[PDB]
């Protein structure tokens, strides 16, 4: 599924991501924009052979099982495929564990490089929320 900007902002709020670990909804929408362009089916292969899955490009190295990432963990206790669903529940639940892991949203390198410190509220500007 390719979300619209305000459509994703509303789905993230419904699932309690808005101000989760003190990150305003614009931070989550910005990170999703640059990780997946709002596409739930987005995948990216890393040089290390791990893979990033879904709207927030969650990595098989730690967070989900894809059966093809030697030595990896599955800390969200999900198959990585669950992160590609039109329903964002698994991605949101798993992102809550990631952002709680100690480095906040720096876990998403694209958030650090493209969202951090920027006018992230522009990402929810005009949305009925
Ligand atoms: Na894994």
Swiss-Prot record:
One of its GO terms (cellular component) is extracellular space. Belongs to the glycosyl hydrolase 22 family. One of its GO terms (molecular function) is lysozyme activity. GO terms for biological process: cell wall macromolecule catabolic process; defense response to bacterium; defense response to Gram-negative bacterium; defense response to Gram-positive bacterium; killing of cells of another organism. Keywords: Allergen, Antimicrobial, Bacteriolytic enzyme, Disulfide bond, Glycosidase, Hydrolase, Secreted, Signal. Residues 1-129 form the C-type lysozyme domain. Lysozyme C is capable of both hydrolysis and transglycosylation; it also shows a slight esterase activity. It acts rapidly on both peptide-substituted and unsubstituted peptidoglycan, and slowly on chitin oligosaccharides. It comes from Gallus gallus (Chicken). InterPro entries: Glyco_hydro_22, Glyco_hydro_22_CS, Glyco_hydro_22_lys, Lysozyme-like_dom_sf. Its EC number is 3.2.1.17. Substrate binds at residue 101. Disulfide bonds join 6-127, 30-115, 64-80, 76-94. Gene3D superfamilies: 1.10.530.10. Lysozymes have primarily a bacteriolytic function; those in tissues and body fluids are associated with the monocyte-macrophage system and enhance the activity of immunoagents. Has bacteriolytic activity against M.luteus. Monomer. This is Lysozyme C.
